[PDB]
Design a protein around this ligand. Structure first.
Ligand SMILES: O=c1ccn([C@@H]2O[C@H](COP(=O)(O)OP(=O)(O)O)[C@@H](O)[C@H]2O)c(=O)[nH]1
Ligand SMILES: O=c1ccn([C@@H]2O[C@H](COP(=O)(O)OP(=O)(O)O)[C@@H](O)[C@H]2O)c(=O)[nH]1
Lengths: 474, 474
């Protein structure tokens, strides 16, 4: 191999987009790198940097030490407030703006790190900023992308963008889709951003932008694990350099980096009330922050919860409706608790928790899998309808409530009551609970030393080290 | 009459509920009283007082001088944050809480004003705090209520609560309702909070609480004017002591009190862009802050606006979606402006404004009438469907777009385009514009010296003065 003529650290430079859905997985990846001694720069537009500085207490240089590793923050000015003015935020307009502004700002940052003696070893982007890979390719800087949805969802978008398999069109809106290494998907089980009936076609186009220059990333980091989607991963690896490294939230947390958070919203305290509950009795209900439920759907949920008589912890976050029935609060004093934002990981790990009524976002899908908590699937849009199909039919840890908002119907209180009673007692409840405990074990092993996800991460670091030549001068 | 043996001022004590929809009309009434030399106390729960102190710059005693009159603020602790805790806000829960807390706090405030030499002469409440009239009656303190919807809407709720006329029920959901002095209302033209199909039955119950003890108010102040609803007012006055004093926003504003505002949201600047527009060309589009439009409806609005080719000023306020088509912004550079919160009164008074696409809330309905601006009716829920029927069929200043969200259908872009083109040219556009200019004149006269609304206000002040005996000691 040759005698050592240099002993440089590596410098990982992550580039975020907007919102907690990108910052948190990106920040979790950066904390893993910093615990292994690498210098990590979390970079983001200034509109994100305002929320990061407000949520945390960053010092004058905005950096924390983790051994010889480090997590530092470098926010760049996207010029958005000056250009956008009084207009309401439009993510379709913004993503194009960040493309132009990012291509101007990133080379300046990278050139400065080169002059300052801290050259960037690897850029890591996400699907909504694929221009990072263009700048990386032009500078001969290795780059990788962090896919934060399931591998099933990746395979759907890949085959759609490349036209490798017939998808539902306006002429045939209801044909099934058979993807390699996947179960057969119904027309409404494909990530419905890609379906012609979607009200959000722009969300699909934005995700599809990752695939136009995907081959510029030498590695596709995935927030999933091999045991969970082994058949889909086997089929995709033959085409793309994907490497499952998830669940990102289950990687061992280093205490010297646990002070940093990517969550921007206040967290209500659920631990105190959960501790008073008998084990495996509370049904945790949450649709996240992006889902906005109509009043009529909330009412049927309240009556279903009330008629089911189950104990519950309901995350009912309003915008800036929603009134619950009066009879609900008469009985809620003994049975349930209603909050606006819960500590979901802590809640799913509590011994009082029995099930998770969820909208089936991929983070929640993985957190339920990793916690051994069975689910009631209540998908709304996007890849949720896909995650819901896997939770119930493939992972076999779930009970179905709805098929997504494109079904265009209110889920009645009788449907809510039946699903709640089914996940809490009877033969189906025992089956999905047992399967969920086998997924909890598999998730805890893949991130442990020697696990599939842990090995792929160290392999990525070593591959970066080889490309950088961190121990051989030139 | 007798020799004068005292020379006291009056003390008007207004009690608000929550939100700008109550604070602003209440504050406008208080400013009118203070310009006529009366001491005015604007009272509200502390959760409102936080927004009032943040929006304004109140001194240590929180009072402004207007001649010998005065506007002062006295916020009381409703104990809500301690009781509610981590629960999301529920107006159904809150209104009952404010009932219990209000009945405890108001007598303490009133008793203190009595001991401090500033006894309250008249209490003025609103329909969502009718317990004020109970406390006023027990203390022999005159009280009046401020009805902030149309007289047509009052007559609907009055006859419903008293069962004087058959309304739509679950058995007969589609029968018409004939109210005295009113045009025939279709089943979906009754304020739909009262219809069995409403998703918000609690909003109707809350308003109906005003009528259970309405007869304790010696006067019912109305934010309408006689010329506008003369036939309905004639029929109601025979039963109830109503006195139209509106439009409240068109009462002459005193400069020494114009610094106080009841609006809590930031105001984008539209005057600069409107000044560059040729006269009577811009279609102002706004659904207020309470209406939350789905993405699919926003898309059709954008394409209708774009295909209509009209100039526009669109108030598109998102919660804390909503993405507009890319083709929209290519053409919006020359034709339109999109903001999050506009100065609506200033916008409706600008000579460039041509029409108002509105959700037909009563404040917006009156502001369009008072400004001489024709409307496209786009009602959502509540009394809006009633205001929309009057705007188009009775006031004859409007063009109909939809019949409310209970119709349960997306208004297509072709319907948006047809309505936009109809209000901006052709014979209907000339007719509704001419009628709107006749309502502008009638509105400006009723608030001027000698007008119907102005006389009813001075008559109310004199009646308070007689009950108080402000010039004769005992
Ligand atoms: O009350 C809540 C709801 C959600 N979450 C977290 O927020 C993220 C949302 O995940 P998901 O991908 O399902 O939501 P989406 O992308 O659909 O908004 C997850 O990490 C959850 O654990 C949380 O901490 N508290
Ligand atoms: O962009 C906007 C929208 C509304 N308004 C004002 O807010 C009030 C809302 O009136 P309305 O009763 O129609 O609304 P709602 O009660 O339905 O929310 C009116 O005084 C409007 O002039 C405003 O100043 N700017």
């Amino acid at each position: 191999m040759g005698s050592l003529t240099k002993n440089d650290n590596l410098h990982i430079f992550l580039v975020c987009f907007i919102g907690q859905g990108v910052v948190n997985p990106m920040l979790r990846l950066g904390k893993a790198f910093a615990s292994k001694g690498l210098l990590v720069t979390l970079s983001a537009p200034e509109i994100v940097g305002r929320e990061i500085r407000k949520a945390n207490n960053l010092n004058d240089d905005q950096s924390i030490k983790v051994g010889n590793g480090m997590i530092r923050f470098e926010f760049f000015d996207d010029g958005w407030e000056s250009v956008n003015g009084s207009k309401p935020f439009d993510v379709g307009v913004y993503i194009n703006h960040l493309d132009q502004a990012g291509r101007q700002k990133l080379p300046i940052m990278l050139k400065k790190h080169e002059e300052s003696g801290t050259p960037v070893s690897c850029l890591i982007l996400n699907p909504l900023v694929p221009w990072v890979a263009d700048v990386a390719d032009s500078l001969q800087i290795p780059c990788a992308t962090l896919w934060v949805q399931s591998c099933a969802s990746f395979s759907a978008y890949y085959h759609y963008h490349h036209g490798l398999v017939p998808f539902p069109t306006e002429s045939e809106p209801e044909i099934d889709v058979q993807l390699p290494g996947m179960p057969l998907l119904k027309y409404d089980e494909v990530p419905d951003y890609l379906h012609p009936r979607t009200p959000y076609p722009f969300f699909g186009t934005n995700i599809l932008g990752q695939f136009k220059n995907l081959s510029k990333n030498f590695c596709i980091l995935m927030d999933t694990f091999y045991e969970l989607e082994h058949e889909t991963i086997d089929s995709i690896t033959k085409i793309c350099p994907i490497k499952p490294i998830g669940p990102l939230f289950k990687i061992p947390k280093d205490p010297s980096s646990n002070g940093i958070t990517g969550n921007f919203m206040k967290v209500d305290d659920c631990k105190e009330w959960l501790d008073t509950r008998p084990p495996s009795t509370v049904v945790y209900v949450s649709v996240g922050s992006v889902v906005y439920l109509k009043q009529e759907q909330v009412t049927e949920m309240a009556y279903g919860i009330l008629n089911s008589e189950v104990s519950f912890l309901w995350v009912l976050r309003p915008p800036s409706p929603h009134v619950l029935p009066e009879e609900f609060w008469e009985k809620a004093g003994d049975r349930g608790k209603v909050v606006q934002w819960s500590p979901q990981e802590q809640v799913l790990a509590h011994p009082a928790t029995a099930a998770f009524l969820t909208h089936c976002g991929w983070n929640s899908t993985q957190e339920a899998i990793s916690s051994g908590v069975p689910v009631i699937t209540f998908p709304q849009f996007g890849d949720q309808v896909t995650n819901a199909k896997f939770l119930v039919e493939e992972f076999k840890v779930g009970v179905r409530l709805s098929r997504g908002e494109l079904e265009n119907r209110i889920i009645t209180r009788d449907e809510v009551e039946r699903a709640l009673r089914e996940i809490t007692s009877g033969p189906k409840a025992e089956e999905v609970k047992e399967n969920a405990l086998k997924w909890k074990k598999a998730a805890e092993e893949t991130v442990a030393k020697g696990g599939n996800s842990e090995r792929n991460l160290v392999e990525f670091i070593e591959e970066v080290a080889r490309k950088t030549g961190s121990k051989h001068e030139s």
